[PDB]
């Protein structure tokens, strides 16, 4: 697999994922990654992005997710189904997302990572998501709506 | 002695030069770190916007 849930007391409180050869876990999600090979790597902190990262082992470097900074208007998908990307924010229908979906990546129509969801905001019709994405120049940025809560 | 001593009476120009270099060097180094700290935060802000 490519997504590795993070377990603290035998329950999943977030998910680790492997993108482009780096293992990304939310910084606010405490626990052990549900793996044996990827759990042994020391992780570097990226608290400005509320993430931690490390190098993928040699045997896992090829079986990882690719990502893109190209985000044309339209529909994107993730574990729970479709995601709307409009007005520069990723949003899901009310109640679709919630606590525990921390580190879950959002995929395009080709299965490429466009953002990593860290939290969200419940709006009138859809929940806005706090994500780590790549801007128009491909540089890592923290894309969050006003009042987002860690999931 | 006819004259009177003071704290700075015995400090030569060479000693003042070393004091100025020491104090100026350390202060400039800290200021360099603070300017770098301010600029990186400004650069990161522009990444978001």
Swiss-Prot record, chain B:
Lipid bilayer topology: Single-pass type I membrane protein
Membrane-traversing stretches: 26-46
Stretches assigned to the Cytoplasmic side: 47-49
Compartments, record wording: Virion membrane; Host cell membrane
Post-translational modification: N-glycosylated.
Role this protein plays: Class II viral fusion protein. Fusion activity is inactive as long as E1 is bound to E2 in mature virion. After virus attachment to target cell via host VLDLR or LRP8/APOER2 and endocytosis, acidification of the endosome induces dissociation of E1/E2 heterodimer and concomitant trimerization of the E1 subunits. This E1 trimer is fusion active, and promotes release of viral nucleocapsid in cytoplasm after endosome and viral membrane fusion. Efficient fusion requires the presence of cholesterol and sphingolipid in the target membrane.
Binding partners and assembly: The precursor of protein E3/E2 and E1 form a heterodimer shortly after synthesis. Processing of the precursor of protein E3/E2 into E2 and E3 results in a heterodimer of the spike glycoproteins E2 and E1. Spike at virion surface are constituted of three E2-E1 heterodimers. After target cell attachment and endocytosis, E1 change conformation to form homotrimers. E2-E1 heterodimers interact with host VLDLR or LRP8/APOER2 to mediate viral entry. Interacts with 6K protein.
Protein name, entry field: Spike glycoprotein E1
Organism encoding this protein: Eastern equine encephalitis virus
UniProt lineage: Viruses, Riboviria, Orthornavirae, Kitrinoviricota, Alsuviricetes
Entire protein: shown range: 1191 to 1239 of 1239
């Amino acid at each position: 697999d490519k997504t590795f849930p993070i377990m603290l007391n035998g329950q999943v409180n977030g998910y680790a994922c492997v993108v482009g050869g780096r293992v990304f876990k939310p910084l606010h999600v405490e626990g052990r990654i549900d793996n044996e090979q990827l759990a042994a790597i020391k992780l570097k902190k990226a608290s400005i992005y509320d993430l931690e990262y490390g190098d993928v082992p040699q045997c896992m470097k090829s079986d990882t997710l690719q990502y893109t900074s190209d985000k044309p208007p339209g529909f994107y998908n993730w574990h729970h189904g479709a995601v709307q990307y409009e007005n520069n924010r990723f949003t899901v229908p009310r109640g679709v997302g919630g606590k525990g979906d921390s580190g879950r990546p959002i995929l395009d129509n080709k299965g490429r990572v466009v953002a990593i969801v860290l939290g969200g905001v419940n709006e009138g019709s859809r929940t806005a998501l706090s994500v780590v994405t790549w801007n128009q120049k491909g540089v890592t940025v923290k894309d969050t709506p006003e009042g987002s809560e860690p999931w | 002695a006819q004259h009177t001593e003071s704290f700075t009476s015995a400090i030569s120009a060479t000693a003042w030069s070393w004091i100025k270099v020491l104090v100026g060097g350390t202060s400039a180094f800290i200021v360099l770190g603070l300017i770098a700290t301010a600029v990186v935060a400004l650069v990161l802000f522009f990444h978001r916007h």
